[PDB]
Amino acid sequence: LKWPRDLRPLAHHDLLYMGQISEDRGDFNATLRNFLVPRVVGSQKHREVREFIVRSLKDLDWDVEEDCFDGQTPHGIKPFCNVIATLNPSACHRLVLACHYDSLLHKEGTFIGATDSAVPCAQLLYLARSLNGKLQNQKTRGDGLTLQLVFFDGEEAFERWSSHDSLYGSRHLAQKWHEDRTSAERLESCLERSEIANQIDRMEVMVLLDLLGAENPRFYSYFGETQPVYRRLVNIESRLNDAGLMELPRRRRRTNYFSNSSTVGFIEDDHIPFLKRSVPIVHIIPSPFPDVWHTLDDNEQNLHHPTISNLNKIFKAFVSEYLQL
Ligand SMILES: [Co+2]
Ligand SMILES: [Co+2]
């Protein structure tokens, strides 16, 4: 079965534009510095990070929803709030980009989770801001497609990871959207042969970012279902390299982050409760995990800025191609 939306390759003019960041650099870093703090569930800093996300997106004229709830954990009842921002609420279909904004409660001390997921959080916001003008124009087309950003709360386990202790915000949102009924007749411009019964059917594909910011990540297609989408990430990365737009240590080297193969690895993450509801998932998470994973060294200084800027180019080009910006 083919992808429901025909995927038009990015014009060279646009590819080249999406590929040269330039002194934007300071803009991404200023964004990122807001997330480079402990973001423990329930805490003042966490609440502050959420406020910053909400305000940043409201200021861009996005519809922003705070999906708050209380849930039982091994540490007692906790408050959780997912942030859901939608460029054009009326559009039937959403390209959904996601990450989690809570940070792990680490036994040894204060944990920043710079790759996990402060970087992905900042990348989402940076995409919204850097592509704002083109996004605002796309929104007026009436073509039934929009961009949606989801910052999940409570992804991390409080104690040992288990079905009950983890993914609090994603489990909640998936169930809520699954039970919120709707149909094609109430929505703007759904695709011809699409079946819409509830809100979760409007997620055309969910692209989940996690554990990004370390040097030389390796990605694979984790889902046969979304291979047509994943392959565009492979093609975009290749075109950027052909154009010499990737930052590399020496001349005549290429990035190969997006491997053209698939792997037999199963990663439990915020995608799962959606995967059970037939949401196509692209899971942008390295394999193997960065060495700093869930250690106190997952910190600001261990981020690899050239890798981050290369990933930023790929994601901007990707969103531009999918939404035909
Ligand atoms: Co983690
Ligand atoms: Co994580």
Swiss-Prot record:
GO biological process: peptidyl-pyroglutamic acid biosynthetic process, using glutaminyl-peptide cyclotransferase
Stated induction or repression of this protein's expression: Strongly up-regulated in salivary gland during blood-feeding on the host. Peak expression is detected 48 hours after feeding begins.
Annotated S-S bridges: 68-81, 92-190, 99-121
GO MF assignments: glutaminyl-peptide cyclotransferase activity; zinc ion binding
Modes of activity regulation: Strongly inhibited by PBD150, 1-benzylimidazole and N-omega-acetylhistamine, in a Zn(2+)-independent manner.
Phenotypic effect of disruption: RNAi-mediated knockdown results in reduced enzymatic activity in midgut and salivary gland tissue extracts. Weight gain after feeding is reduced. Females lay very small eggs which fail to hatch into larvae.
Tissue expression per record: Detected in salivary gland and midgut.
Cell compartment(s), UniProt: Secreted
Domain of life: Eukaryota
UniProt key word Repeat: no
Keywords recorded for this protein, A-Z: Acyltransferase, Disulfide bond, Glycoprotein, Metal-binding, Secreted, Signal, Transferase, Zinc
Function of the molecule: Responsible for the biosynthesis of pyroglutamyl peptides. Seems to have a preference for substrates with neutral or hydrophobic amino-acid residues at the second and third positions.
Family membership: Belongs to the glutaminyl-peptide cyclotransferase family.
Designated name of the protein: Glutaminyl-peptide cyclotransferase
Species name: Ixodes scapularis (Black-legged tick)
